[PDB]
């Protein structure tokens, strides 16, 4: 969509509500497969709750977009190259968008809590461009009310650290496993990033070895925030298990976990809501404390698609 210039990025929708348009300050990218980043501070210096997302990019030429919150972006830029980087702190993701894969709405009564003493001070907008003279604005409008929300959003990231894929190695599994600590969470959507060797990602709840699937996606598919059929009450003492499967047939050297095209990532992003009272904005698992368990896993997790 177009550029604003005289209208600016902030739109009141009334007093206790406005939308915020986060869009690249007129960019002219002359590369195919190019990742561009930029940051914007909150208008209000407080607890807002981010309640919607209106996506706006030339389907022509915009492959995928990610929006996270964090309190210190990786450059003082007008824009920059995301390979340079997002937030030098934890960038916790709010929104993801894919072309061939329209996202879903948040549920009414839900919102990511931002700013204030605790919440995120900045939004950072990663914007992937596909194949390709002029000037580009495209990106994401928000809609954030000051009105507190019943159900707070957040992310449980399960991600491998140590994984390694030996070259030509028909199959290498990577497994994450964590025990649940906080108040329960209903899980309403998901996404799954891995680079190429990604055959398939998948993730579950386990209550007395009782596997009840969350998400399953071949990560070469556009890694949107895909919805979870019927919601999943993750309570205390449940185990989050996840498996990315990769192959090594592809390249001539040892692939390890990393943020570059040549490396791999087994990330599984798990977007939940919790009761306001009990809610906390993001959890994480870098461990695989229940490793043996996984024999019990579904074979739906180990065969492809
Ligand atoms: Cu429930
Ligand atoms: Cu990556």
Numbering used by the authors: 45 to 176, 182 to 354
Show sentences the authors wrote:
The structure of the H107A mutant crystallized in the same conditions as the wild-type is highly similar to that of wild-type PHM. The structure, except for the lack of Cu2+ in the CuH site, is very similar to that of wild-type PHM (RMSD = 0.42 Å for 283 Cα carbons). The mutant does have Cu2+ in the CuM site and the geometry of the coordination is almost identical to that of wild-type PHM. The coordination of the copper at the CuM site remains unchanged and even the two remaining histidines at CuH site show only minor changes.
Two enzymes, peptidylglycine α-hydroxylating monooxygenase (PHM; EC 1.14.17.3) and peptidyl-α-hydroxyglycine α-amidating lyase (PAL; EC 4.3.2.5) working sequentially are the only proteins known to catalyze this reaction. PHM, a two Cu enzyme, catalyzes the stereospecific hydroxylation of the glycine Cα of peptidylglycine substrates. The two copper atoms in PHM, CuH, and CuM (located in the N- and C-subdomains, respectively), each use a single reducing equivalent from ascorbate to catalyze the reduction of molecular oxygen for the hydroxylation of the Cα of glycine at the carboxy-terminus of the peptide substrate.
